[PDB]
């Protein structure tokens, strides 16, 4: 079934998820010169102080850190959003080399990886309902460049040993996701989709302008995970990123 390999990669997904060819597919290239500065855009409000992480999991596609989304603990509001969106999980997409890995590109520049903090609109009751809605999800996207070490990422890097193969999970309580945020919360926003199957066109994408840097040692560790389950032939989990999609009559708005 789907993946990122020659035989089941992005170029094939349309055969089972026809929406892959739709009107607001993600990721896209942010062309800085034609993005419209919008002054009606409010600041983001990220309230991650009371977030409760529970578990990290290798799901065969990436590793996800999941959060308890039963009460308004970590929420995103403001920006292009109306309403409150709950953090349910975060994951990354990364490359096999440092000059690729981001899904979204900025003027065709690709970053080493990209963090997605997935949120769902609480007005819809539960996550599974939010994914049937045009404005059901908001994903906060953060570019990562190789440079200095990010202190708050180390905690995630250490556990990766425990979850090397598909289907393994480790408990991962008390992680503060605030340690993954940049200094500036300036962003670009546009309406788009999930970048993995089922490729649903449910998302307001908030892509922050400022990257976080991680060391090559940290993102190296990402590259040692496996797409395979235990006892299957080993395939290193790298390049789990979808290429940019045509913007097809959408306008990327900028808060700056």
Ligand X SMILES: CCN[C@H]1CN(CCOCC)S(=O)(=O)c2sc(S(N)(=O)=O)cc21
- Please indicate if the annotation marks 1 as binding a ligand: no
Which one, 137 or 181, has the nearer CB to Hg ion?
137
Query: Is 61 one of the catalytic residues?
Result: yes
**Which residue of 57, 139, 163, 208 would you call a contact of ligand X, by CB under 6 A?**
139
Q: Which does 219 bind (CB under 5 to 8 A by kind): Zn ion, ligand X, Hg ion, none?
A: none
User: Are 177 and 48 spatial neighbours (Cβ–Cβ below 8 Å)?
Assistant: yes
Q: Is the dihedral of CA 141, 77, 210, 191 positive or negative?
A: positive
Nearest to 30 by CA among 233, 155, 186, 159: 186
The answer to whether residue 131 forms part of the interface with ligand X (CB under 6 A) is yes
- Please indicate if the annotation marks 119 as binding a ligand: no
Shortest distance, position 175 Cβ to ligand X, whole Å: 17
The answer to whether residue 54 forms part of the interface with ligand X (CB under 6 A) is no
Contacts of 256 (CB under 8 A, 6+ apart): 37, 186, 187, 209
Which residues here bind Hg ion, judged by CB under 5 A?
200, 202
User: Are 205 and 245 spatial neighbours (Cβ–Cβ below 8 Å)?
Assistant: no
Which one, 48 or 120, has the nearer CB to ligand X?
120
Cβ neighbours, 10 Å, residue 5: 11
Which one, 116 or 119, has the nearer CB to Zn ion?
116
User: Are 99 and 110 spatial neighbours (Cβ–Cβ below 8 Å)?
Assistant: yes
Nearest to 177 by CA among 23, 9, 65: 65
Shortest distance, position 33 Cβ to Zn ion, whole Å: 26
Nearest to 1 by CA among 197, 190, 154, 142: 197
Compose the 219-238 pattern: x for residues touching ligand X by CB under 6 A, - for all others: --------------------
User: Are 226 and 165 spatial neighbours (Cβ–Cβ below 8 Å)?
Assistant: yes
Shortest distance, position 164 Cβ to Hg ion, whole Å: 33
| Catalytic residue positions, numbered | 61
Residue ranges of the annotated binding site for substrate are: 195-196
**Residues in the site for ligand X, rule: CB under 6 A?**
59, 61, 89, 116, 118, 131, 139, 194-196, 198
């Amino acid at each position: 079934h789907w993946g990122y390999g020659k035989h089941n990669g992005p170029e094939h997904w349309h055969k089972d998820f026809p929406i892959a060819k739709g009107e607001r597919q993600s990721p896209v290239d942010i062309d800085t010169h034609t993005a419209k500065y919008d002054p009606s855009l409010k600041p983001l409000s990220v309230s991650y102080d009371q977030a409760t992480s529970l578990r990290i999991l290798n799901n065969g596609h990436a590793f996800n850190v999941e959060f308890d989304d039963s009460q308004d603990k970590a929420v995103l509001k403001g920006g292009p959003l109306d309403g409150t969106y709950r953090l349910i999980q975060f994951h990354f997409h990364w490359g096999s080399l440092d000059g690729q890995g981001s899904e979204h590109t900025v003027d065709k520049k690709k970053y080493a990886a990209e963090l997605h903090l997935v949120h769902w609109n609480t007005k819809y009751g539960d996550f599974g309902k939010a994914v049937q809605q045009p404005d059901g999800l908001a994903v906060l996207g953060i570019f990562l460049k190789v440079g200095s070490a990010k202190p708050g990422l180390q905690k995630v890097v250490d556990v990766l040993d425990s979850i090397k193969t598909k289907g393994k999970s480790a408990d991962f309580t008390n992680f503060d996701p605030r340690g993954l945020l940049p200094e500036s919360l300036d962003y670009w926003t546009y309406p788009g989709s999930l970048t993995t199957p089922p490729l649903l066109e449910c998302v307001t994408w908030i892509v922050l302008k400022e990257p976080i840097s991680v060391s090559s040692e940290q993102v190296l560790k990402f590259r040692k995970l496996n797409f395979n389950g235990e006892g299957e032939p080993e395939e290193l989990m790298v390049d789990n990123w979808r290429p940019a999609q045509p913007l097809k009559n959408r306008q990327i708005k900028a808060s700056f």
